[PDB]
Amino acid sequence: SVTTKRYTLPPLPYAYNALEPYISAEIMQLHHQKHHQGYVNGANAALEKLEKFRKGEAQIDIRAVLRDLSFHLNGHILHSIFWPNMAPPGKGGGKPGGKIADLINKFFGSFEKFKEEFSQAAKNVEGVGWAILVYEPLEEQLLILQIEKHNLMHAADAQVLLALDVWEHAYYLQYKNDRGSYVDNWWNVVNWDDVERRLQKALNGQIALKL
Amino acid sequence: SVTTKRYTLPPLPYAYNALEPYISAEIMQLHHQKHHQGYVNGANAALEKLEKFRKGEAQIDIRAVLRDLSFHLNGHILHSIFWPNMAPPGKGGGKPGGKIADLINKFFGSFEKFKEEFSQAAKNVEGVGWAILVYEPLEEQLLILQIEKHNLMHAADAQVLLALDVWEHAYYLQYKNDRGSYVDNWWNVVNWDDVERRLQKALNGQIALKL
Amino acid sequence: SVTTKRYTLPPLPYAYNALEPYISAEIMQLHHQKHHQGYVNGANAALEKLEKFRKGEAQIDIRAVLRDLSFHLNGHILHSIFWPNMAPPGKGGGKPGGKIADLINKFFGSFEKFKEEFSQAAKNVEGVGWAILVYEPLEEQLLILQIEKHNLMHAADAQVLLALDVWEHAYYLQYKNDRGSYVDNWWNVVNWDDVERRLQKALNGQIALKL
Amino acid sequence: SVTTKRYTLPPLPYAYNALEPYISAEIMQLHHQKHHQGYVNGANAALEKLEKFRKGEAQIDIRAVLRDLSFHLNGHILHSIFWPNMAPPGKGGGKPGGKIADLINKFFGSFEKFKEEFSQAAKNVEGVGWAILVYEPLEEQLLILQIEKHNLMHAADAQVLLALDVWEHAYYLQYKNDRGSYVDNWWNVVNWDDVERRLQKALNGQIALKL
Numbered sequence: 001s002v003t004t005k006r007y008t009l010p011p012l013p014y015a016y017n018a019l020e021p022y023i024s025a026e027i028m029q030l031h032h033q034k035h036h037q038g039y040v041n042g043a044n045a046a047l048e049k050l051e052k053f054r055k056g057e058a059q060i061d062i063r064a065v066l067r068d069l070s071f072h073l074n075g076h077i078l079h080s081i082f083w084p085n086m087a088p089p090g091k092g093g094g095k096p097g098g099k100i101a102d103l104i105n106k107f108f109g110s111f112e113k114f115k116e117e118f119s120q121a122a123k124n125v126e127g128v129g130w131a132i133l134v135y136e137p138l139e140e141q142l143l144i145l146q147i148e149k150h151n152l153m154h155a156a157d158a159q160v161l162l163a164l165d166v167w168e169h170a171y172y173l174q175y176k177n178d179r180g181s182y183v184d185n186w187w188n189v190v191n192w193d194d195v196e197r198r199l200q201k202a203l204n205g206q207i208a209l210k211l
Numbered sequence: 212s213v214t215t216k217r218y219t220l221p222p223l224p225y226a227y228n229a230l231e232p233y234i235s236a237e238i239m240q241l242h243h244q245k246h247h248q249g250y251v252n253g254a255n256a257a258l259e260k261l262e263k264f265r266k267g268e269a270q271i272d273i274r275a276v277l278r279d280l281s282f283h284l285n286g287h288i289l290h291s292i293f294w295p296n297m298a299p300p301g302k303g304g305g306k307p308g309g310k311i312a313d314l315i316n317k318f319f320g321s322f323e324k325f326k327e328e329f330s331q332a333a334k335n336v337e338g339v340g341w342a343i344l345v346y347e348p349l350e351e352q353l354l355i356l357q358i359e360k361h362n363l364m365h366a367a368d369a370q371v372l373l374a375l376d377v378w379e380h381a382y383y384l385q386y387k388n389d390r391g392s393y394v395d396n397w398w399n400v401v402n403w404d405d406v407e408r409r410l411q412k413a414l415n416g417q418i419a420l421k422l
Numbered sequence: 423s424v425t426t427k428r429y430t431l432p433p434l435p436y437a438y439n440a441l442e443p444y445i446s447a448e449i450m451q452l453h454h455q456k457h458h459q460g461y462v463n464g465a466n467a468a469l470e471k472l473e474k475f476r477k478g479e480a481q482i483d484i485r486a487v488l489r490d491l492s493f494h495l496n497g498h499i500l501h502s503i504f505w506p507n508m509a510p511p512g513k514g515g516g517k518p519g520g521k522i523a524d525l526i527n528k529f530f531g532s533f534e535k536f537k538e539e540f541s542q543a544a545k546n547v548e549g550v551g552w553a554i555l556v557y558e559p560l561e562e563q564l565l566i567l568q569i570e571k572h573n574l575m576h577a578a579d580a581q582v583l584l585a586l587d588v589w590e591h592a593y594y595l596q597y598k599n600d601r602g603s604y605v606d607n608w609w610n611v612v613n614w615d616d617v618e619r620r621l622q623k624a625l626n627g628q629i630a631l632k633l
Numbered sequence: 634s635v636t637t638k639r640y641t642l643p644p645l646p647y648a649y650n651a652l653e654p655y656i657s658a659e660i661m662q663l664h665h666q667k668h669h670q671g672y673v674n675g676a677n678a679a680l681e682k683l684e685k686f687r688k689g690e691a692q693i694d695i696r697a698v699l700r701d702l703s704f705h706l707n708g709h710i711l712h713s714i715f716w717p718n719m720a721p722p723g724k725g726g727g728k729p730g731g732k733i734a735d736l737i738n739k740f741f742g743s744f745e746k747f748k749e750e751f752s753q754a755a756k757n758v759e760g761v762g763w764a765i766l767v768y769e770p771l772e773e774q775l776l777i778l779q780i781e782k783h784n785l786m787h788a789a790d791a792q793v794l795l796a797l798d799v800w801e802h803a804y805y806l807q808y809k810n811d812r813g814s815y816v817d818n819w820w821n822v823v824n825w826d827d828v829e830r831r832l833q834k835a836l837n838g839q840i841a842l843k844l
């Protein structure tokens with residue numbers, strides 16, 4: 001018996017227009033319905049090829065399919081964090097509080113310095129990718145990392161707490177080439193409650209999904 | 212107030228010659244004292260630059276330093292797993308048992324198919340890198356991934372259970388260009404108890420470290 | 423005495439709206455005035471850092487600056503080919519003639535199959551990048567390659583004859599996520615005379631950039 | 634009619650032990666007979682898959698195959714330049730003369746400054762790769778570039794004049810982890826005559842191969 005677990009597109013936690021004016025309904029719709037859906041589809045396509053190989057039903061270029069899986073699986077995972085990382089202005093935006101504020105102050109000095117560091121990491125991704133805030137479980141610290149594509153430069157075992165997508169399709173329709181203004185405006189929709197919930201799990205030595 | 216947590220070289224769980232003749236005493240000594248040491252130093256060097264930056268003390272090429280951090284931090288994590296992943300012949304090397312055996316059977320059909328898929332993965336790494344078995348927490352399944360260098364193609368949030376280093380320095384002194392037979396002999400030193408300990412943590416929703 | 427030669431943005435060979443309706447004037451303006459200009463600026467910035475190093479005037483993270491140079495210099499070179507690779511419909515579009523048609527038939531069987539393979543390569547670039555047709559001088563043959571970002575997967579010494587940009591900024595404002603329709607519409611503006619001129623140089627074992 | 638031109642392994646210009654004590658006989662033999670042969674084999678295997686698709690004979694993962702082709706073709710091209718780039722001690726490996734010396738002085742200030750930049754580039758390659766010196770035809774200057782694997786970070790259209798392999802298999806049997814002393818010692822075998830012939834070709838606007 002051989003099984004693979006398949007992936008599905010999660011619904012947004014809010015309406016397509018809920019993050020306006022900071023991210024347009026048009027972007028939200030395309031980004032979720034087309035781009036995120038495509039990564040779910042691609043991940044499942046790679047799994048089907050692997051399962052067929054595991055069954056002894058077909059051959060496989062192992063490198064090619066695992067490269068494909070890594071790309072799409074990561075697109076799916078990062079977007080799945082990205083949506084609840086944001087919230088309509090009110091629930092979204094402003095400064096953090098609770099444990100996340102304290103830990104940000106601890107490792108980065110202040111929220112202002114963290115904001116600068118995270119923004120600069122996002123603005124300076126070469127090509128397409130992400131800025132992420134992770135909890136590194138080995139020495140138990142917050143780190144900012146750049147991710148290229150969806151799958152390059154992750155820290156093994158690390159838990160993603162906050163993710164900012166700087167693929168051109170995350171902003172181009174509204175901001176055009178001005179990724180900087182997009183990054184700066186995105187702070188207005190950060191759902192700190194979600195980031196806090198992720199950090200709480202991470203601090204307890206747990207995987208920070210499925211809140 | 213700014214802090215960063217620094218990394219340290221862990222001792223091997225055994226002697227340098229404990230994995231002989233499957234992997235050389237010379238390789239063990241160089242691999243750990245020189246190669247793994249380098250990654251610790253590299254990670255700490257990156258942290259210093261970030262810490263200095265966070266204090267508004269110096270400037271930074273944030274892309275460069277985060278690239279450096281990603282490479283070296285991953286070097287340090289993967290090797291930190293790699294050593295206890297192995298055990299002296301007898302204690303190490305056999306067929307899996309418990310939950311790891313059953314889940315391997317569930318997703319791959321048999322241990323034989325898994326062993327084939329994992330070996331194909333390790334032998335077909337383009338350039339230097341790793342073959343890894345992860346627990347993927349989103350749909351809760353085992354996956355094999357190829358890693359290039361130390362930091363390319365990880366699955367975000369996923370827990371590393373088993374890792375094989377196929378960087379040339381992991382084998383060349385003993386096996387020369389013959390990576391295939393190095394991968395083949397490595398099975399004889401696999402510590403299935405360690406992998407089981409990591410899988411149980413992952414199943415618990417915990418980080419597969421510290422145990 | 424230390425010198426570096428600096429790069430400059432070439433003017434377009436036609437008006438911004440000359441490729442309508444296949445590529446909008448809005449895209450052409452941003453793509454040239456912002457995106458291409460940025461690569462020129464980035465390549466010159468990396469050179470100034472290298473020049474300061476060569477003067478013994480400043481220290482340098484050599485890996486970082488050389489990665490930066492490679493990215494930007496390639497962005498500049500590929501865009502510099504991209505623009506004259508296209509022409510207003512009439513001069514642009516249709517099927518190739520002369521030596522290019524013959525060599526396409528020799529290596530690909532027909533212009534139909536070539537166009538199929540080139541379009542598929544473009545559509546299937548993972549993340550951002552290019553499809554290119556090159557002359558490979560060592561064994562003297564046409565090859566299609568996928569380029570990721572601007573600088574990943576080029577053939578050393580090979581001459582670029584035809585280049586198609588599939589970075590999202592090349593099409594997103596007009597075609598949104600539908601890269602496939604962008605790729606298909608682009609054939610209508612291909613400047614075959616320019617491709618022929620490049621092939622003519624490459625066939626004599628010449629560098630095929632400046633004619 | 635569909636054709637692909639296939640590749641072949643070139644003989645070394647000298648005996649395996651001809652570069653001792655700087656690069657060992659054992660290394661020269663494995664490096665050429667095993668590693669370089671593998672790249673020739675891989676390039677032809679990829680071309681066979683492409684040829685089969687062009688005839689409409691089989692389906693293809695165009696991204697996978699073109700990735701494979703890029704890696705192995707570049708392996709083959711760079712190793713082909715690598716061997717004649719070197720010569721037995723004395724018989725070639727001191728300081729450059731003629732045009733190569735003049736342009737090195739022009740762009741790097743002096744040979745000593747060039748040597749430092751080239752050495753530093755090679756020593757600071759992350760993972761496996763190359764340091765190369767290229768003639769960049771757009772602004773007609775010399776540049777040093779780092780290459781990762783065989784195919785990452787080349788400059789489109791540029792002509793490779795000098796290549797230094799820093800893949801681990803290029804030095805590990807003799808130098809172990811000490812890549813630095815290998816890079817330092819390689820200068821004793823550089824064939825500046827070969828480099829000069831490549832430069833003159835690039836200056837003529839020719840591809841820097843076949844002589």
Ligand SMILES: [Mn+2]
Nearest residue numbers: 035165167170
């Ligand atoms: Mn996205």
Ligand SMILES: [Mn+2]
Nearest residue numbers: 246376378381
């Ligand atoms: Mn290692």
Ligand SMILES: [Mn+2]
Nearest residue numbers: 457587589592
């Ligand atoms: Mn572009």
Ligand SMILES: [Mn+2]
Nearest residue numbers: 668798800803
């Ligand atoms: Mn080599």
